[PDB]
Design a protein around this ligand. Structure first.
Ligand code: ADP
Lengths: 271, 8
């Protein structure tokens, strides 16, 4: 619902406020509604105009209450912007670390998982993969509202397996075996990650496979090693992480079954 | 620590 065009924003309707991230992301104020928005910027000189813009295209397609909302883009002249709704509390990982473990009880936690599991069931149906699911890419709002964000590596998808361009580098501890080894991502890659994103949340923000090196993860997943149940974590929810960490992507639950597990306070099928 | 990295 932007200014003078469907998604085209005049560089004028936005009033930049200040850097927030490193390829630069600022906080601004969108005049027509005096709404505070986030503005992702492109490094003026790097053959990205094509790549960068693909992100703002995956977004125009999806619209869910737990997926950060695209509000517009600037393309006709540089620098190229991508404007979205602002999320006052920033990324979930950080929030979790700093947060107060009293105001954030084990139910607020459950609440966050459910919010995310919901955005994935939706994404699952629209048939989209979020090639980089993890706390550092979830944002937070008022009263622990959580929204999934960062659709850089996000792909729509025809067949049910995407082969990532060879010679790449990805977040080892969140990446699934069949991807770390064959550069093939699927809506089952996300399920694997989601399994990590629950471990992150449960441990109030720790780093996955703690103390273990990146080079040792895969060979360790092959020997059947998996992380142990976080403290204070309900055996019901751990049980669900394992599901997400099945060596065979075919034996992993779906987001639809996963969301059901949560939304139902556990009165549904991954066993 | 370091997040990203390639597999071999
Ligand atoms: N919609 C948004 N609302 C509030 N903050 C945002 C939004 N989108 C992105 N950000 C912030 O922009 C920053 C960009 O970080 P970035 O440089 O892209 O790599 P990284 O996330 O690993 O630090 C993030 O820390 C995030 O908090």
């Amino acid at each position: 619902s932007p200014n003078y065009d469907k998604w085209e924003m005049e560089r004028t309707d936005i009033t930049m406020k200040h850097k927030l991230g490193g390829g630069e992301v600022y906080e601004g104020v969108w005049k027509k509604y005096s709404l505070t928005v986030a503005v992702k910027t492109l490094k003026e000189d790097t053959m990205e105009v094509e790549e960068f813009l693909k992100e703002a295209a995956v977004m125009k397609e999806i619209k869910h209450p737990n997926l950060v909302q695209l509000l517009g883009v600037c393309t006709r002249e540089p620098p190229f912007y991508i404007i979205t709704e602002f999320m006052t509390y920033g990324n979930l990982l950080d929030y979790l670390r700093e947060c107060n473990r009293q105001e954030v009880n084990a139910v607020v936690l459950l609440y966050m998982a459910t919010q995310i599991s919901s955005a994935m069931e939706y994404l699952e149906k629209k048939n989209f993969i979020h090639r980089d699911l993890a706390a550092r890419n979830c944002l937070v709002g008022e009263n622990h509202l959580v929204k999934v964000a960062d659709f850089g590596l996000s792909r729509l998808m025809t067949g049910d397996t995407y082969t990532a361009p060879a010679g790449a580098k990805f977040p080892i501890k969140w990446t699934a075996p069949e991807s770390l080894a064959y550069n093939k991502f699927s809506i089952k890659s996300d399920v694997w990650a989601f399994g990590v994103l629950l471990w992150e949340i449960a441990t109030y923000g720790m780093s996955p496979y703690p103390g273990i090196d990146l080079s040792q993860v895969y060979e360790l997943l092959e020997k059947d090693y998996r992380m142990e149940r976080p403290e204070g974590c309900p055996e019901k929810v751990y049980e669900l992480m394992r599901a997400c960490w099945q060596w065979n992507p075919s034996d992993r639950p779906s987001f639809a079954e996963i969301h059901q597990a949560f939304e139902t306070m556990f009165q549904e099928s991954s066993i | 620590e370091e997040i990203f990295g390639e597999f071999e």
